[PDB]
Amino acid sequence: EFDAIKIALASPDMIRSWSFGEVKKPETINYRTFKPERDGLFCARIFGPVKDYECLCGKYKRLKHRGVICEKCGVEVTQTKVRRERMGHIELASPTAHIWFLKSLPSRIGLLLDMPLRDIERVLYFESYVVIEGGMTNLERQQILTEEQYLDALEEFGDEFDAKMGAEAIQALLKSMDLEQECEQLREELNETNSETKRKKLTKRIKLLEAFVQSGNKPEWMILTVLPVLPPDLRPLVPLDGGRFATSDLNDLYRRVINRNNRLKRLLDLAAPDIIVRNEKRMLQEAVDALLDNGRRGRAITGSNKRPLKSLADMIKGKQGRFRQNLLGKRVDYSGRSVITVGPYLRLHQCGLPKKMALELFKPFIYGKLELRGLATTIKAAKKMVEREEAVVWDILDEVIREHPVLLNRAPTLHRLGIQAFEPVLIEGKAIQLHPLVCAAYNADFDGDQMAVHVPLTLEAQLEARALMMSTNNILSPANGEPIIVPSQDVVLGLYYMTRDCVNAKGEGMVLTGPKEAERLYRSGLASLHARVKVRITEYEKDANGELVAKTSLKDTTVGRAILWMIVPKGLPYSIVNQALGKKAISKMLNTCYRILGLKPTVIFADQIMYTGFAYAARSGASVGIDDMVIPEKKHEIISEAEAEVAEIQEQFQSGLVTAGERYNKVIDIWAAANDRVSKAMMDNLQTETVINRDGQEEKQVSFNSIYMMADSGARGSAAQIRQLAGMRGLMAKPDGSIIETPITANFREGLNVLQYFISTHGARKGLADTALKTANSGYLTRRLVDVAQDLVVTEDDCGTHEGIMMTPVIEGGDVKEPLRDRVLGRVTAEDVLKPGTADILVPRNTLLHEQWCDLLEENSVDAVKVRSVVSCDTDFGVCAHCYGRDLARGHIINKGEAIGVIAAQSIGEPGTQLTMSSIQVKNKGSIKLSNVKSVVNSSGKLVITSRNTELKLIDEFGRTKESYKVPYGAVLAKGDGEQVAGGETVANWDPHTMPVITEVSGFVRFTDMIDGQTITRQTDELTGLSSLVVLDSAERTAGGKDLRPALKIVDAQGNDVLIPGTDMPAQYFLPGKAIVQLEDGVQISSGDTLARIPQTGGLPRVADLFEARRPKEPAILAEISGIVSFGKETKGKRRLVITPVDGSDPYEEMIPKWRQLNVFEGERVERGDVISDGPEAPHDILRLRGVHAVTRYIVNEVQDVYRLQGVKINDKHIEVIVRQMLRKATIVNAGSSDFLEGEQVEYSRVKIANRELEANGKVGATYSRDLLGITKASLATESFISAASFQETTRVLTEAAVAGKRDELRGLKENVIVGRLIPAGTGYAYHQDRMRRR
C-alpha cells in the first residue's frame, strides 16, 4: 500500500486544518447524565457521537437518521469508530515553547541563537530581557537585559528600540533570521577559521542551518501558538478494563492548560499590572511544558502517592511506551500456558496437550466442522453442543488435530531453539508432555517450569512450522555445528552401565552367532550383561559409490555391546561401540551418524538410544547409598601432619623470624598442598576399590561405586563435587575476595560444624546475588547486540572478490589453543592452497571446505589459508553467501535470504549468563625461528638480541609452528637460529628488574655531560661499593639542568664518534634519569654488559566494553610514520616528542605525560603502526594505522579468549559480522570530483557507490577514512529513525529527525514489524524482491 514514512515539523495552519473545532472549556462531563459538556474536553460536536447514530438529546437513533446532523447540538450522525481519530486544538493566547527543542542537549534553539542556554531559559521564565533590534544605540541584537539595566536604558533611551522578554521575543528573533545569507557568512568564516574547536562549532551550526534551509521548515515553528488535543477515546475519562479503574491522566494535564489559558484571556479584559500578566504567562509556559514532556523541567508534578504523573511523551519512552510494549511485543489470542512433564514414551516430533486446553484453543475449527457435517444449524447450537462435551466432539477434535502443529515456547527465549513446533497428542491431565531430549534446547528443568502454547492458523504458517521449526529439523545448534540432541543424564548412565566389562562374570568365554543370541542369553538370565565374550558380527560400509558392502568377523566384546549393536543403523564401524561409552562418546557417535548417513536415520537412531538407555538404566537399579562416599583412612594423617607443620611456621613468625605476609602465604601454600594430596588419595582409592579374582588369585578394574559411575560417565558431576563429598572442601573466600587461613577440613558425609557452615553460607549467597545481577546485565547486552545488527540479510551469492583473512591456528606460546581444522571448517577459501611442496596446489581457490578437505589439509601439514570473510565482503546492503560460509545448522552453504545478523546476535549473547563477573623453557622438540631480529654475539660466547619486535617461533620437524615466545630488548639466546632444542632447558634469559641498554658497536665511553649539582649525583653503591653515579630525573634536578639533559656520545679511544656499523650516526643517546653507570669512565666496552641500568577484567564486562570500543585508561602510543625520534621542550603541561621521517616531512610533534616509559629511543627507526609505549590497546588506532583486518582479528581474538576460558564454543562468523556492522561510517577528507563535505560522516556503502559512479568516467573519487563506533552508537546513528526510536532515547533521535525532516523506506526488519508486513528474511525476502522489482 503505502511507501516510506515521512516526518517534518508542524506549522500552526496544519494543526488548524487537522482539527474539527476549537476546544474552549475546561470541564468534561455533566456529572448526572454522563453526557459531554457543551464545548468541553469531550463535546460530541467536536469529535463525534458518544454512542452509535445518536445525539445527547435523543432525536436520532437508527439508520433512518444516518448522515444528517442534529439540530440543538448539531452533532453529525455516524459510527462511533470515528470518535477514535478526530483531533481538537486549543488556541493559545501567549505563545509557548516546545520543551523538546530547547532542552534536548543540544538545543536546536540554543545553537541557532548562538547563546548559552541559561540565557534563553532566563528569558523564557521572565527574569531578564532581550534586545531585539538593537538599532541606533549601544545595544546588541542578542543582548540580555537585567530589569535594572532595562529600566535604566529606558531612562536614557526610552526610544523606539525594541526590548522584550518571553516566548514572543524569541519568536520574533527566529522570525528575523535570514538563512541563506547566514549560511554564506558561516561558510566564509569556516574557510577562514584556524582553530579546531571553533571550526567544529561552526560546522555543526552550518550543518543545522543547511538542514533547515533545504527542507520546507521555518524556525518560529518551534514556538507553539496552537496546541492540538488528543482524541478522547485514546484517553477515556476512566479506562475501565475491569477490576481496578485507571485514570488516563492526560485529561488532568489538558484541563490545567485550558484553565490557565482561559484565565490569561480574562486578564486581557482587566488590564492588570503587567507583573501579574507576566506571572500568568510564566505559569502557562510551565504548564504546556509539563504537559508535553514532564520532568524535563526542574521538578515533575505528582498527582498523588508522590508518583509523577505520566506526561504525553512518557507514552513513548521507557520500557512501557508504545514501542517496547505494544508495537514490538503484544499479547496474542489462541494461546495457552501450563506446567510441563516428561512422557518418555513420545517420539521426537510430538508433545502432550491436555484435552481441556486443546478443546479451548481449536474451538472455531470445531464449530466449522460441525456446521459442515450438519450436526447443528446456528452457531449457538454448536456452542451448546461443545459445552455439553457430547461424545461427538472428541472424534471431531482428534480429527482436526491430526496434522495441526503447535508452537511451544519457554519464558526467557535466549536463542533460536527456545521456540519449536510439534504435533500434539491428546492427554488426560492438565500438564504438557515433553520429549526428554528437547529439554536441552529449552534449558527446561522440571522443578515446575511453565510453557506457552501457540497455534498457527493459515496455510503458510502451518507449512512454515512443519518445514522450518519442527523439532526434527533443528538438531545442530546454529552457533556451532555441534549436535544439540545429546542424551543428557540418565540415558548416559544407562548406556554407560550397559557397555562395560566386569572381570569374571556369569556366562563368559562362550561364542555367539550374532547379537540376538546375546540378547536371549541376557533375558534368560543364563549370562551376565557385562562379561567378556567373542561374538560374530556383520558390518555394512559405504566405501563404495554410496553403496554398502557388508563384511563379517568374530569380534571380542562384552554382552552389552553386542545387544546395543542391534540399535546402530546400517553404515557405521563397529569400533564406535566397543569402548565404555561415556557421554561425549555417544555425542560423537550421533555426530558421525549425522555426517555419514544423513538426517532421518540420525533422529531415528537418537530416539532408539533414548529408549534403550532408559530401559537399561531402570533394569540397573542404580541407587546411591550412604556407603558410596568412602573416606581415605589416611585423610586424618594428611590433616594431622599439615596442622602439626603449620604450628612451626606460626611460632617461627611469632618469635620474630619472618614477616606476617610471608607467614600467611606459607600457610596458604601448605593448605593447598594438603588439599590436593587428600583429593588425589581419595580419587585413586575410590576409582579402583576393585580387588577381585578371575579363576586365579585377584585383579583390579575400574570400580562400580555408583558415585564413580555417575562421575566418570559424565552423567552428573565433576571430581570437584566428589572431593567436597569425601575429602576436605577447599578454602573458602572472604567478603573482600581474600582467603581465610584455616580451610574446611570436613565434608558432606561428616558434619561441618557451625563456623564452617557460616563461611560456606557467605560464599553461597555471594554466588546467588551474582547470578541475579548477571542475568540482569546479560539481558541488556544481548538487546544492544540484536539491535545493532538487526538487518543483515544474505542478498547475493558471491561478492566477487579475492580477499580474506589468513586463518592460522592460534598458539598462546606453549600448547596450541585451536587447530587450523576448526577455524576454517566450513568456510569458503579465497585462493587455492599449496602443498608444502610449493607450486603443488592441494585444493582449488573457491571451494567450500567440509570435512574431507579438512582432513586432507590436516595430514598434509598445511599451516595457514587465506579464507574469505564477511568483514571484507564486497556487497552493498547485505553480504554474499560465499563470504559467509556454511549455515552451521545445515551441512551446506547458507541460502540466499537468511537473517544472519539476528542469529549471530543471539548466539553471541546466549552464553552470557554462563560467564563470570623470565626465560623460555621450551618443552618440545623442533626447529627454531626468529622474527624481527637485531642482535650481537656477546663477550661470553652467546648471542644477545637487542630489539623489541623480537619473537621466537618454534616449528616442529614438518613446517608448522607449535610454540611462540617473546624476548625483550637484550636477551641472551643460548642457541642460534635453525638449531633443534630439547625439553627442559632454557634458550634465553634477561634481567627483567632493569633495562639492558648495551650499545651495538665497539668503542669507548666517558663521564661526559655527567656533572654533579646540575646534571648527575655522586652515589657510592650501598651494596658493593663501586662508584655508581646515578643521574637524577630532570624534574628532580636543578631548574637550569632540567632541560640540559646528560648524554654519552659513544666514541673510541681517539674521541671520534664510533659509527654504528653501516650507520652514519653513532649511538648518541640521552640517558634518562635513574640511569646508573656503575662502571667507571674511559673503559673499553664489549657487548655483554649494559651501559646504564634503570631498575624495576575478564568477565562479561570485558565483552561489553570490547563491543562498545571503550578506550582504555593508559593506551599504548603508536608510530604514525617512519623516521627518528627527538625530545624538546620539557613539560609545556606535558613533555614533548617530535618524530621525523626518513624522506617525508615530519608531521608528528605531540605531547606525552612524563610517567610514560618510552619504548623507542632517538636514533631508532620505526614504521607505521610500531609501538612507542606500553599498556592496553586502543582499537581505533589499530584500525586507522594497521588497517581493517588487524582490528577484526584483534576483536575476534580477545572475545574468543573470554569465551574460551569458560568452555563455551562459538564459531567466528558471528563476531565477524558484528564487527562488520560496527565499522560502517566513513569520514571523508577530500571530495575529489564528488560533492560531499569535509567533516561529515557517510554510509561507507554510499560513498563507495559514489566513487564507483564517478570512476565510471575519468573523474576522481573521494578519499576517506573508516572509523570504529561502539554498538550503542552505530545503532542510534543509523539511516532510519523508527529503528533508532525503538531503541533508547527516542526524544533526541526523534526531534533531530523532525528538524531535518527525514524519510524512512523501512528497508529493514525492526521497522517492518512495527508496520506489520512480511519481513525480508524468509519467504518475505522473495516477496520483497518481487515487490521492489515492481518498480
Partner DNA sequence: GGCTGCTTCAGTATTTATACTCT
Partner DNA sequence: AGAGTATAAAGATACTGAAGCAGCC
Residue 194 contacts which entry, Mg ion, another protein, DNA, none (Cβ below 5-8 A, type-dependent): DNA
Q: How far apart are CA 933 and CA 988, in angstroms?
A: 14
If binding is defined by CB under 5 A, does position 627 make contact with Mg ion?
no
Q: C-alpha grid cell for residue 1124?
A: 627518528
Residues 58-97, interacting with Zn ion (CB under 5 A): 72-73
Q: How far apart are CA 746 and CA 1214, in angstroms?
A: 46
| Minimum CB–partner distance for residue 271 and DNA (Å) | 16
| Minimum CB–partner distance for residue 776 and another protein (Å) | 15
Site size for DNA, by CB under 7 A?
Answer: 38
**How many Cβ atoms from other residues are within 10 Å of residue 800's Cβ?**
11
**How many Cβ atoms from other residues are within 10 Å of residue 1212's Cβ?**
23
* Of the residues 17, 33, 181, 194, which one makes contact with DNA according to CB under 7 A: 194
If binding is defined by CB under 7 A, does position 1134 make contact with DNA?
yes
Q: How far apart are CA 837 and CA 959, in angstroms?
A: 11
* 1331 conformational bin, left if phi > 0, alpha if psi -120 to 50, beta if neither: alpha
Q: Which range touches another protein (CB under 8 A), out of 14-22, 111-119, 499-507, 1217-1225?
A: 14-22
Closest CB to Mg ion: residue number? 447
- 32 by Cβ neighbours in 10 Å (0-12 / 13-18 / 19+) ranks as exposed
If binding is defined by CB under 8 A, does position 898 make contact with another protein?
yes
If binding is defined by CB under 7 A, does position 1133 make contact with DNA?
yes
Closest by CA to 338, choosing from 455, 451, 454, 436, is 451
Residues 765-784, interacting with another protein (CB under 8 A): 783
If binding is defined by CB under 8 A, does position 462 make contact with another protein?
yes
Q: Which range touches another protein (CB under 8 A), out of 170-178, 321-329, 501-509, 917-925?
A: 321-329
| Minimum CB–partner distance for residue 1182 and Zn ion (Å) | 23
Residue 451 or 881: the one with the smaller Cβ distance to Zn ion is 881
SS3 1159: coil
Looking from the CA of 327 toward its CB, the CA atoms found within 13 Å total 23
Residue 72 contacts which entry, DNA, Zn ion, Mg ion, none (Cβ below 5-8 A, type-dependent): Zn ion
Pairing of strands 431-433, 144-145: unpaired
Residue 338 or 1211: the one with the smaller Cβ distance to another protein is 338
* Of the residues 118, 600, 619, 734, which one makes contact with DNA according to CB under 7 A: 118
Secondary structure of 148-184 as H, E, C letters: HHHHHHHHHHCCCCCCECCHHHHHHHHHCCCCHHHHH
Residue 455 or 883: the one with the smaller Cβ distance to Zn ion is 883
Residue 1132 contacts which entry, another protein, Zn ion, DNA, none (Cβ below 5-8 A, type-dependent): DNA
Whether the Cβ atoms of residue 1121 and residue 1184 lie closer than 8 Å to each other:
no
If binding is defined by CB under 5 A, does position 451 make contact with Mg ion?
no
Q: How distant, in Å, are the alpha carbons of 1106, 1116, 1168 from that of 1112?
A: 10, 9, 21
Residues 271-310, interacting with another protein (CB under 8 A): 272-273, 276, 279-280, 283, 292, 301-304
What does the angle CA 1244 – CA 1246 – CA 1249 come to, to the nearest 5 degrees? 110
Q: Which range touches Mg ion (CB under 5 A), out of 442-450, 492-500, 1114-1122, 1127-1135?
A: 442-450
Whether the Cβ atoms of residue 174 and residue 219 lie closer than 8 Å to each other:
yes
* Of the residues 447, 627, 633, 736, which one makes contact with Mg ion according to CB under 5 A: 447
Residue 445 contacts which entry, Zn ion, DNA, Mg ion, none (Cβ below 5-8 A, type-dependent): Mg ion
Q: C-alpha grid cell for residue 66?
A: 444516518
If binding is defined by CB under 5 A, does position 57 make contact with Zn ion?
yes
Q: In what order do the strands lie in the sheet with 549-558?
A: 511-512, 532-541, 549-558
Q: How far apart are CA 280 and CA 263, in angstroms?
A: 8
Residue 334 contacts which entry, another protein, DNA, Zn ion, none (Cβ below 5-8 A, type-dependent): another protein
If binding is defined by CB under 7 A, does position 246 make contact with DNA?
yes
N- to C-terminal Cα separation, the chain: 13
Q: C-alpha grid cell for residue 504?
A: 569374571
Closest by CA to 974, choosing from 989, 988, 956, is 988
Site track 519-548 with another protein (rule: CB under 8 A), x = hit = ------x-----------------------
* Of the residues 636, 734, 765, 1110, which one makes contact with DNA according to CB under 7 A: 1110
Site size for Mg ion, by CB under 5 A?
Answer: 2
* Of the residues 1, 3, 445, 556, which one makes contact with Mg ion according to CB under 5 A: 445
| Minimum CB–partner distance for residue 442 and DNA (Å) | 23
Residue 367 or 1287: the one with the smaller Cβ distance to DNA is 1287
Q: How far apart are CA 1167 and CA 1175, in angstroms?
A: 19
If binding is defined by CB under 7 A, does position 1098 make contact with DNA?
no
Whether the Cβ atoms of residue 1141 and residue 1167 lie closer than 8 Å to each other:
no
| Minimum CB–partner distance for residue 614 and another protein (Å) | 4
| Minimum CB–partner distance for residue 446 and Mg ion (Å) | 7
Residue 126 or 653: the one with the smaller Cβ distance to another protein is 126
Adjacent-strand bridge partners of 964: 953
Q: How far apart are CA 555 and CA 577, in angstroms?
A: 12
If binding is defined by CB under 8 A, does position 194 make contact with another protein?
no
* Of the residues 158, 242, 661, 983, which one makes contact with another protein according to CB under 8 A: 242
Residues 362-421, interacting with another protein (CB under 8 A): 363-365, 367-369, 371-372, 379, 407, 409, 412-416, 418-419
Pairing of strands 335-341, 450-454: antiparallel
At residue 232, φ and ψ (nearest 5 deg) are: -75, -40
Distance, C-alpha 912 to centroid of its chain: 9
Residue 1273 contacts which entry, Mg ion, another protein, DNA, none (Cβ below 5-8 A, type-dependent): DNA
Residue 428 or 447: the one with the smaller Cβ distance to Mg ion is 447
Whether the Cβ atoms of residue 1286 and residue 1314 lie closer than 8 Å to each other:
yes
If binding is defined by CB under 7 A, does position 1148 make contact with DNA?
no
If binding is defined by CB under 7 A, does position 196 make contact with DNA?
yes
If binding is defined by CB under 7 A, does position 773 make contact with DNA?
no
At residue 1069, φ and ψ (nearest 5 deg) are: -115, 145
* Of the residues 749, 1102, 1156, 1292, which one makes contact with another protein according to CB under 8 A: 749
If binding is defined by CB under 8 A, does position 1000 make contact with another protein?
no
Residue 305 or 623: the one with the smaller Cβ distance to DNA is 305
Q: How far apart are CA 1097 and CA 1080, in angstroms?
A: 47
At residue 43, φ and ψ (nearest 5 deg) are: -50, 130
**How many Cβ atoms from other residues are within 10 Å of residue 204's Cβ?**
13
Site track 1313-1332 with another protein (rule: CB under 8 A), x = hit = xxxxxxx-xxxxx-x-----
Residues 90-109, interacting with DNA (CB under 7 A): 103, 105-106
* Of the residues 112, 572, 880, 1199, which one makes contact with Zn ion according to CB under 5 A: 880
If binding is defined by CB under 7 A, does position 191 make contact with DNA?
no
If binding is defined by CB under 5 A, does position 450 make contact with Mg ion?
no
Residues 810-849, interacting with DNA (CB under 7 A): none
Q: Write down how long the chain is.
A: 1335
Q: Which amino acid is at 1014?
A: Q
Helices within 917-1047 (DSSP H only): 1040-1043
Q: Which amino acid is at 1124?
A: I
Site track 1233-1272 with DNA (rule: CB under 7 A), x = hit = -------------------------------------x--
Beta-carbon contacts of residue 1155 (< 8 Å; ≥ 6 apart): none
Residues engaged in binding DNA (CB under 7 A): 103, 105-106, 110, 116-118, 194-197, 244-247, 303-305, 317-319, 776, 779-780, 783, 1105, 1108, 1110, 1132-1134, 1151, 1270, 1273, 1288-1289, 1291-1292
